[PDB]
Design a protein around this nucleic acid. Structure first.
Lengths: 39, 251, 390, 558, 107, 107, 96, 218, 94
RNA sequence: UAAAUUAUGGUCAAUUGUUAGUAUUCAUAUUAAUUUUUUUAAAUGUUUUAUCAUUUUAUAAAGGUUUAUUUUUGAAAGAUUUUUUGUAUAAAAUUUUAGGAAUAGUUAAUAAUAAUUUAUAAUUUUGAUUAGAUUGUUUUGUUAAUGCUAUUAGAUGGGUGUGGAAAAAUAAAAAAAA
């Protein structure tokens, strides 16, 4: 098979950082904006 | 834009001759430390080679205005002890300063006296040394020192002019430093010697029955050593040699 | 190599420089020696041959000329190599000495091919047949002789190649003595060329080698030479050469079409030479390399009529038997067909008469470059036209 | 290691750089100086495969490689391919040619209508070869070719080249010499920091600071300009000298055992072809004298005289005294030629070294021949006469103060003393060359034979140990030959010569190696330890990658 | 003198200078003044230093002390950065108040 | 190398020296070594014909050019600035005669 | 294109580049301004110049005019007349 | 700038260049000028020490560094010690004086190649067959050539005023190599430089490891 | 990566930890580590006299030793006389 | 206005499962959950040295806000040597805000290290400065999708001016001169 450039990037990240490619970060965090000043 | 003209890696440094800890003071034995070996080698050269302007008349008579410009760094030998003009004489009596002519006093010529002549303006200095007797070295017939009556009424004096309070580069005699051989061990074989057929050549090593006598039995030290000199980077005995080649130290 | 004072040479200067006297030398053998010397080079040897301190226009023109020379030499190198390969192939297949292979015939080829096919080697017999058929067309010991000699003459003209044919460390093939050979086969061969071929310059320019001035001046010289040998009392001037007052044998070089033709003007008549022979008139024009100017170069029918009428007025020839022929020629060279037609209509001499009058026309072999069909068609039409008679 | 010069030349190619003629010259020079003549020819072949036409300086470097290697076929191919068409400078010709090529530039119209590959400039040396050849070095090319043909044995070609060279240099002007270009190095304009330790920094030995050469030279050198700055007649003298040098090296190559000192008894007697070699050399010298005539009196011939003395001392084996006589006769001939009387010049160190070497060769011997402990000397050897002559010569040299006395001169003096069998070589070494010179251990290799003849075995041993201590105190390592000489007497004098680490590693490595060789299984090849495969930066084939196109889920296109 | 040298890297100006030509626009009075009053100020300063040396020595001592006894005299990377206010932005405002803005040029 | 630039004071300083070397040479001309000297003087003249120049400086430049037998590339600018000087109040018969002599010796 | 020459030995060159927006498949051309260096004051406003980067000459000047591709003939003639290279604009930035 | 017009501008430039090559037709042989030097090297700034004043690779040697010079020999009166004593002899020094140098300049040059501490120590004057030479006279005006016997008579003064302020290797390029132990005409100038270390590339660009997919070029 | 290991080990003279050294000794690329010591055989005891006796008993000769060193470190592609003759150019000499 | 020329003298098809790749469910997936577990209580031994000292041992956190950088040759690697000469400082280019305007220890030139000078200087509506938010971050998630969405590699002008380099008040350990 042929791999993406993402595979090459993941290989580089794994080699430099020792397996640390990602963390599977939470994506659906519910943000809110709180207004401090007047309208 | 006066900031992007050049780099800043190599800035201008204060001149090495304006730092008190780098300039040799003529009133200390460290001054005579730097000059004595140059006198030794100069005398050895003068004993075996004719050097042009080392034997001279009364004194180099330059004008009073050109004296300090042309004179410093100049050296010359003279017959008999006579001192230059317009100088204040200070005879060094310090043993710590006179110890540095010991190899000059013993292996070249016995030194009568050493004196420092300071100009009246306190800007130029003359180290002058009076030697007595004949040279302990064999003097060649052509050597410029063979043209000195005092050598070979029997005292002659060297003069060396230098600026005071300058780095030890001032106290350097480089041009008087060419190694001319002295032919002592070859004159007997030369035709000029009638002691010429009296030597019997040894073309062959004698047949040896005995072996070299063994050294005294090796006794290990009995005191606390500092460690391995090769490991600590101490040259053999801290005197000479190579760290890699350890010898003559303990073990 | 290039020198600070090296310069290109003209024909008179080449003849003066290589002015040597000789009585007997094999042109073919010396040419073969010089060609083997050329072939035994690296591409580097062609590098530093443009004289410096020379204007950029002439420098570039010399660059085109030298590149053309090198390309022609390389083409002949490949042809010579293939010919020798076929010679070795025939000699090996048949068993005959390779020396006598060059004088065999189709009967011998048939018999040898029959023997090969009988012995069961059909592919080998086909190889022999193809080699012989391909070699009977390319094996003449002097095959492109005029092209090769003109190439050597161009090398001589360049003026930077005199020194590349000597000072070689060789070894005696028999005694095995290593020495420096100073003989200059290029010098001897060029001396022979200049001595013998008095109009080798005309051949060299006709073949299309001259990139500086083209072949127009050499064409004028050739035409005047034939006029001088066709008449018997010829007076020449700058632009006008006349024979007798009764035969009307006049050559008149009108102008230079290439420089005269401006690209932004509308005029139909610009001709190079005008030749009247007795009662017939011909306009010789060298077709310009620009297809959008060839059409303005070819004169109109009514202008042709006017030229005929003026000729009648001036020379008193009756309008009855005045007839003009318009003649078109290739831009940068001449064809063999073009030269023979030029001789046929301008001088009214046949092919055998032409070859008797000029020896080298017999084997002057040139063809129209197929890359340009516009000129072929236009020249076909103009030369197939009839005599406009009024 | 010398291979690294070729490696760095090849990295220029692999990095898509165009090496210049200066790079090729430097690589050839360094490899020849290291003795890798095959690698030098490899550099030349790399140049050719790159298709760069060599400057005449590159031609000269390659021809120097060919001269040293004695390969005439190499030089003949080089000559036929490149060196031909070279000519000497003519009286009317311009001395340096004007620079022809204008530096590469593009106008506002070319920048638009030209393609990139035509607008691109990569410093191609072929563009600049002709402006490199502004100066005529055909003189050097012809000299090198004559040397190559003489070494190869083609005397007719040698005569051709040399006659052309000599007539050109007698009838044609000198070309302007190419000045050295100082832009080939990246030195700082000045020393950033002024340290300048004293000459007497050490209280034990005398050192050599970067400011002053304060120990006396360790080798004699010739005081002359470079080959390019010579006149035509001066370079003719140089040409005769150099052809004599090539005759010498070829004689040494043909007879390596008669030219190495104190190795075999054949060193003492001249070979069969020596007389013809000397006849050729002497007739060449007479040809030089006849050609130049009175003009020779104003040409420096110290190097030529040194070469003459060396060729007569090696090929001819003439005694040192006869060598000095020949030197004096040559100098007097030169002085007399010119009708300028009452003024003759003196010999230099460069040829005083040759006469001293002649004396050393006279006194040489074969050490420890046939295990008999007896040294075999030349037949008819007269130590007293040799010593008298050497002492007279040394006194003359010392009386002349314009001779600099490098260390090799003292080495020949010491070797002559040791061979003559006087027991004062050690005293002379101590007084004249111990503390005042940077001496190698060849001095001690001679002084050890001197010591071995001492009456007392203990005196022998103690002198050996003191010599070792000298090697330590003054920074002169003991050579392998000296160490082996002292080892071969370990039974009589038990002077250890190998370090307690060196002997242990020798023990273990040697036993392991003999065991490994005697073992059969481990003799089998090992691809993991034998070699490296593909030390290049990039793969030798296309694995398919890269993919220069994005993907459907990819927005970052470039 | 309108095209620089591609191989030597010389600019238009150096090519013209080497050719011996001069492609200079007609200058206005203020431009000519800029190019003219370079020498007058140098001569004024040199004459000041030659004429009254006490004040010149005072001013030179002031400069030298103000420099030597000054912070950020290391000639490190931070000091060597060409545009400090823009290269080091987070410092401005909350740490350094010398510069009230982070942009002074086209960058 | 471009590390310097010459103004009319420097050019007028140099030109007499080169004229003196010319007069001291065996032939009338200097060696080829001075081609760059003359080229630099040429570029300096060409550039400084655009700045503001005094009558004395222009006259000295003309006299130096006459002495050195050197025709500049900015001959047109030089003569234009001479026109812009002939009818000035500062101009006197001495200045005019020097200018005319220099221009004749050149042209 | 040389846009301003109010500084001595310095030319302001307006250069353009392209930004790519995949969502709209657009190729929009942006503009950038550079302080160039011309030591002999040979550039006039309106010249099409070829500019090359190099070492730093000033705080904001790290380019130089390698060549003038198309000089402003009208600007040079106006400077000969003694006018401004280009008449100054009448609009500009608001003061508030 | 709109790239679409590049083709049209290319056609216009081609036609303009052809019109230029066709109309003016005034090329010719013009002397090329030395390319001088450029201040606009790329990268970061360089220090004072390394400003050798050339910022590009030029493989040729231009005229200004080329000098016309003649190999003169200068004779010296030296005395050698033979068994008897002080035999008179002759010493020579090779000097490369430019053709246009004056006799004073030749004398000053000879002062500089006198490495010998014994030869040029007292004031001397140059002479031809005894006739002293005028120190402000050019070589060509005396007609002296390399085949000219010229002597140096050493007047027995002392303290010869010297100025080593001019480096032995001083060309128009203003290079100053610190070591002045040999003249440029004597230095080979091409030899292996041991005062350095060859350095390999220890910084991988894009490829660091297991698989060379693309090499992360750039 | 044997090629890169040889590059960094030989030309770059990098350092080597004991755990990697032991791992590589398994591959035939390096000798067994200094710390891979067998608990059975005690470490050697050296005597200068015995070592000297062995060295003298079987010492190599100068030229063979130097040529082995040259082959190991400096060069390994040294051509034979036959290969030099083969590479040598032939009759025409062009 | 080209006008229907007589060979009809060759018919007998297609299908054999063999691939040049984004494919679309408005409700299934997707999150906090129906299945969320598991532990965690600080108070601390780097080392060698000639000994009241000296040599080796340069990126912890929170806070403050983040241009888009960095090969001190200078220490080590490291060798037949020798430099604190083995070119580290640069540039191009990509940002956000519902109520959109002015900014400045300022731009270039310079015989000016350390600017008493000269100029019609410099940033900005092609969106600057300040303020607000604010490490960047084709790596996350989702989809038929060049759409949407998510993120922790770091860095650090007043604490010794030491050092090759401040990165220096804490150290899952990268073994640190037997």
């Amino acid at each position: 098979p042929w791999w993406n450039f993402q595979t090459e990037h993941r290989q580089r990240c794994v080699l430099m950082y020792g397996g640390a490619r990602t963390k599977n970060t939470h994506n659906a965090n519910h943000r809110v904006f709180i207004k401090k000043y007047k309208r | 834009s006066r900031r992007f003209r050049y780099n800043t890696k190599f800035p201008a440094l204060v001149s090495y001759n304006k730092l008190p800890w780098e300039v040799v003071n003529h009133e200390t034995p460290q001054f005579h430390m730097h000059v004595a070996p140059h006198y030794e080698q100069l005398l050895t050269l003068a004993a075996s080679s004719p050097v042009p302007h080392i034997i001279s008349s009364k004194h180099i008579d330059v004008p009073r205005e050109h004296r300090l410009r042309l004179l410093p760094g100049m050296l010359y030998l003279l017959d008999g002890d006579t001192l230059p003009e317009e100088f204040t004489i200070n005879r060094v009596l310090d043993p710590t300063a006179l110890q540095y002519y010991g190899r000059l006093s013993s292996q070249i010529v016995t030194v009568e006296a050493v004196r420092m002549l300071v100009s009246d303006d306190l800007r130029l200095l003359c180290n002058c040394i009076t030697f007595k007797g004949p040279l302990h070295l064999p003097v060649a017939p052509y050597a410029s020192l063979a043209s000195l009556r005092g050598a070979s009424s029997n005292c002659f004096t060297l003069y060396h002019f230098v600026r005071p309070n300058r780095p030890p580069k001032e106290l350097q005699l480089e041009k008087y430093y060419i190694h001319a051989p002295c032919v002592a061990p070859l004159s007997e074989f030369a035709s000029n010697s009638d002691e010429r057929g009296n030597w019997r050549p040894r073309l062959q090593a004698p047949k040896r029955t005995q072996r070299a006598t063994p050294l005294p039995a090796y006794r290990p030290p009995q005191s606390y050593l500092m460690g391995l000199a090769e490991r600590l980077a101490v040259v053999p005995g801290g005197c000479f040699g190579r760290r890699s080649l350890m010898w003559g130290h303990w073990f | 190599h290039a020198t600070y004072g090296a310069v290109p040479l003209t024909h008179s200067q080449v003849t003066s420089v290589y002015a040597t006297d000789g009585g007997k030398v094999d042109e073919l053998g010396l040419l073969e020696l010089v060609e083997e010397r050329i072939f035994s080079w690296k591409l580097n040897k062609w590098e530093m041959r443009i004289p410096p301190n020379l204007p950029n226009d002439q420098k570039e023109l010399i660059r085109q000329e030298q590149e053309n020379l090198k390309q022609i030499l390389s083409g002949w190198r490949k042809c010579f190599g293939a010919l020798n390969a076929d010679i070795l192939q025939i000699s090996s297949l048949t068993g005959v000495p390779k020396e006598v292979v060059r004088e065999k015939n189709r009967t011998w080829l048939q018999e040898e091919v029959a023997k090969l096919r009988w012995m069961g080697e059909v592919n080998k017999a086909a190889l022999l047949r193809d080699a012989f058929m391909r070699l009977e067309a390319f094996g003449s010991r002097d095959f492109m002789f005029m092209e090769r000699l003109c190439c050597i003459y161009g090398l001589a003209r360049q003026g930077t190649f005199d020194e590349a044919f000597t000072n070689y460390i060789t070894e005696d093939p028999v005694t095995n003595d290593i020495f420096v050979d100073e003989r200059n086969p290029f010098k001897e061969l060029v001396a022979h060329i200049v001595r013998n071929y008095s109009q080798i310059d005309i051949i060299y320019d006709f073949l299309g080698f001259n990139y500086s001035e083209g072949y127009r001046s050499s064409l004028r010289r050739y035409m005047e030479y034939l006029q001088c040998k066709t008449a018997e009392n010829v007076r020449a001037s700058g632009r006008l050469v006349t024979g007798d007052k009764g035969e009307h044998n006049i050559l008149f070089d009108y102008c230079v079409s290439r420089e005269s033709l401006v690209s932004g003007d509308s005029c139909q008549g610009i001709i190079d030479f005008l030749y009247i022979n007795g009662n017939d008139v011909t306009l010789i024009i060298i077709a310009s390399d620009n297809p959008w100017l060839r059409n303005r170069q070819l004169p109109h029918r009514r202008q042709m009529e006017g030229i005929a009428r003026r000729v009648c007025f001036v020379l008193g020839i009756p309008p009855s038997e005045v007839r003009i022929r318009n003649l078109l020629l290739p831009p940068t060279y001449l064809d063999k067909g073009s030269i023979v037609r030029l001789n046929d209509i301008v001088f009214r001499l046949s092919n055998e008469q032409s070859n008797l009058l000029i020896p080298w026309l017999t084997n002057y072999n040139k063809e129209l470059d197929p890359k340009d069909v516009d000129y072929t068609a236009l020249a076909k039409t103009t030369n197939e036209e009839e005599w406009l008679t009024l | 290691i010398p291979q690294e010069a070729l490696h760095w030349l090849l990295r220029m190619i692999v990095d898509n750089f165009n090496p210049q003629h200066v790079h090729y010259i430097a690589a050839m020079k360094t490899l020849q100086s290291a003795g890798e003549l095959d690698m030098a020819r490899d550099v030349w072949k790399i140049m050719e495969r790159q298709q760069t036409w060599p400057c005449t300086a590159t031609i000269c470097a390659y021809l120097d490689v060919c001269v040293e290697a004695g390969e005439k076929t190499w030089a003949m191919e080089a000559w036929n391919r490149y060196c031909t068409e070279l000519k000497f400078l003519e009286p009317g010709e311009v001395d340096p040619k004007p620079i022809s090529r204008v530096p590469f530039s593009l106008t506002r119209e070319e920048l638009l209508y030209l393609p990139k590959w035509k607008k691109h400039f990569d410093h191609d040396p072929n563009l600049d070869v002709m402006d490199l050849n502004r100066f005529n070095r055909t003189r050097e090319v012809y000299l090198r070719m004559a040397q190559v043909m003489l070494a190869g044995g083609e005397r007719n070609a040698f005569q051709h080249f040399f006659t052309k060279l000599e007539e050109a240099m007698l009838n044609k002007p000198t070309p302007v010499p190419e000045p050295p270009n100082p832009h080939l190095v990246r030195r700082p304009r000045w020393a950033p920091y002024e340290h300048c330790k004293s000459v007497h920094h050490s209280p034990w030995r005398l050192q050599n600071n970067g400011r002053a050469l304060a120990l006396g030279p360790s080798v004699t050198i010739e005081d002359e300009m470079q080959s390019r700055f010579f006149s035509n007649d001066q370079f003719l003298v140089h040409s005769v000298k150099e052809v004599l040098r090539i005759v010498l090296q070829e004689h040494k190559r043909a007879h390596p055992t008669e030219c190495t000192r104190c190795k075999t008894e054949a060193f003492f007697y001249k070979t069969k072809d020596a007389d013809e070699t000397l006849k050729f050399c002497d007739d060449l010298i007479e040809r030089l004298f006849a050609s130049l005539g009175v003009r020779l009196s104003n040409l420096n011939t110290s190097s030529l005289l040194s070469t003459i003395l060396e060729v007569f001392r090696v090929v001819g084996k003439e005694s040192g005294a006869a060598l000095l006589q020949r030197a004096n006769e040559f100098l007097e001939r030169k002085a007399s030629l010119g009708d300028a009387e009452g003024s003759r010049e003196n010999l230099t160190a460069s040829n005083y070294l040759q006469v001293l070497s002649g004396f050393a060769d006279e006194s040489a011997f074969v050490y420890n021949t046939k295990k008999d402990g007896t040294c075999q000397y030349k037949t008819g050897f007269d130590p007293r006469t040799t010593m008298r002559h050497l002492a007279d010569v040394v006194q003359e040299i010392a009386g002349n103060p314009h001779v600099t006395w490098a260390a090799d001169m003292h080495l020949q003096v010491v070797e002559t003393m040791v061979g003559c069998g006087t027991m004062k070589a050690n005293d002379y070494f101590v007084r004249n060359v111990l503390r005042q010179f940077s001496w190698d251990s060849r001095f001690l290799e001679v002084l050890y034979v001197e010591y071995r003849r001492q009456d007392d075995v203990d005196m022998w041993a103690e002198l050996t140990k003191r010599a070792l201590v000298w090697t330590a105190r003054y920074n002169a390592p003991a050579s392998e030959r000296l160490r082996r000489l002292i080892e071969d007497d370990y039974d009589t004098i038990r002077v250890q010569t190998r370090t307690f680490r060196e002997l242990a590693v020798f023990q273990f490595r040697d036993v392991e190696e003999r065991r490994h060789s005697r073992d059969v299984v481990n003799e089998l090849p090992n691809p993991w330890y034998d070699y490296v495969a593909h030390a290049l930066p990039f793969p030798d084939r296309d694995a398919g990658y890269p993919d220069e196109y994005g993907d459907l889920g990819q927005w970052r296109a470039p | 003198g309108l095209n620089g040298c591609v191989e030597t890297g010389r600019s238009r100006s150096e090519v013209a200078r080497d050719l011996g030509l001069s492609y200079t626009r007609p200058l206005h009075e203020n431009e000519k003044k800029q190019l003219s009053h370079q020498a007058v100020y140098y001569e004024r300063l040199a004459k000041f230093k030659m004429e009254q040396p006490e004040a010149a020595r005072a001013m030179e001592r002031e400069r030298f002390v103000r420099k030597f006894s000054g912070m950020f005299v290391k000639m490190d990377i931070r000091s060597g950065a060409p545009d400090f206010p823009s290269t080091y932005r987070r410092l401005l405002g909350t740490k350094v108040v010398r510069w009230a803005s982070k942009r002074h040029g086209p960058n | 190398a471009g590390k310097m630039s010459l103004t009319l004071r420097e050019v007028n300083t140099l030109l007499p020296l080169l004229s003196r070397m010319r007069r001291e040479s065996p032939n009338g001309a200097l060696d080829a070594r001075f081609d760059r000297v003359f080229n630099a003087i040429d570029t300096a003249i060409g550039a400084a014909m655009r700045h503001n120049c005094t009558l004395d400086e222009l006259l000295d430049l003309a006299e130096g050019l006459a002495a050195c037998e050197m025709v500049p590339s900015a001959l047109k600018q030089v003569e234009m600035v001479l026109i812009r000087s002939v009818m000035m109040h500062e101009c006197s018969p001495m200045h005019l005669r020097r200018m005319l002599q220099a221009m004749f010796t050149l042209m | 294109y040389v846009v301003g020459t109010s500084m001595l030995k310095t030319a302001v060159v307006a250069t353009n580049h392209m930004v790519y927006y995949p969502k709209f498949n657009q190729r929009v051309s942006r503009t950038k301004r550079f302080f160039a260096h011309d030591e002999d004051l040979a550039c006039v406003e309106g010249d099409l110049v070829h500019i090359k980067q190099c070492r730093k000459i000033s705080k904001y000047k790290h380019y130089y005019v390698f060549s003038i591709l198309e000089p402003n003939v009208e600007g040079r003639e106006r400077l000969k007349l003694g006018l401004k290279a280009v008449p100054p604009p009448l609009f500009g930035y608001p003061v508030s | 700038l709109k790239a679409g017009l590049l083709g049209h501008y290319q056609q216009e430039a081609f036609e303009a260049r052809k019109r230029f090559e066709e109309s003016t037709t005034y090329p010719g042989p013009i002397r090329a000028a030395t390319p001088g030097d450029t201040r606009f090297y790329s990268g970061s700034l360089e220090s004072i020490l390394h400003d050798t004043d050339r910022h590009y690779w030029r493989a040729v040697t231009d005229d200004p560094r080329v000098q016309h010079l003649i190999p003169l020999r200068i004779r010296f009166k030296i005395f050698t010690w033979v068994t008897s004593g002080w035999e008179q002899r002759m010493q020579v020094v090779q000097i490369m004086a430019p053709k246009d140098s004056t006799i004073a300049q030749v004398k000053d040059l000879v002062l500089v190649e006198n490495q010998s501490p014994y030869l040029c120590v007292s004031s001397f004057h140059l002479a031809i067959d005894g006739k002293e030479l005028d120190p402000q006279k050019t070589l060509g005006e005396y007609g002296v050539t390399e085949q000219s016997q010229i002597d140096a008579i050493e007047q027995n003064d002392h303290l010869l005023h010297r100025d080593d302020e001019r480096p032995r290797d001083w060309t128009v390029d203003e290079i100053t190599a610190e070591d002045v132990k040999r003249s440029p005409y004597k230095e080979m100038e091409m030899q292996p430089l041991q005062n350095l270390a060859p350095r390999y590339e220890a910084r991988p660009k894009g490829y660091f490891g297991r698989t060379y997919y693309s090499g992360m070029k750039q | 990566d044997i090629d890169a290991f040889k590059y960094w080990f030989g030309v770059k003279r990098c350092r080597l930890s004991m755990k990697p050294w032991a791992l590589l000794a398994k591959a035939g690329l390096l000798p067994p580590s200094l710390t891979q010591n067998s608990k059975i055989m005690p470490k050697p005891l050296f005597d200068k006299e015995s070592l000297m006796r062995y060295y003298l008993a079987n010492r190599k000769d100068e030229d063979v030793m130097a040529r082995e060193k040259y082959l190991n470190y400096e060069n390994s592609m040294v051509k034979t006389e036959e290969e030099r003759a083969a590479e040598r150019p032939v009759a025409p000499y062009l």
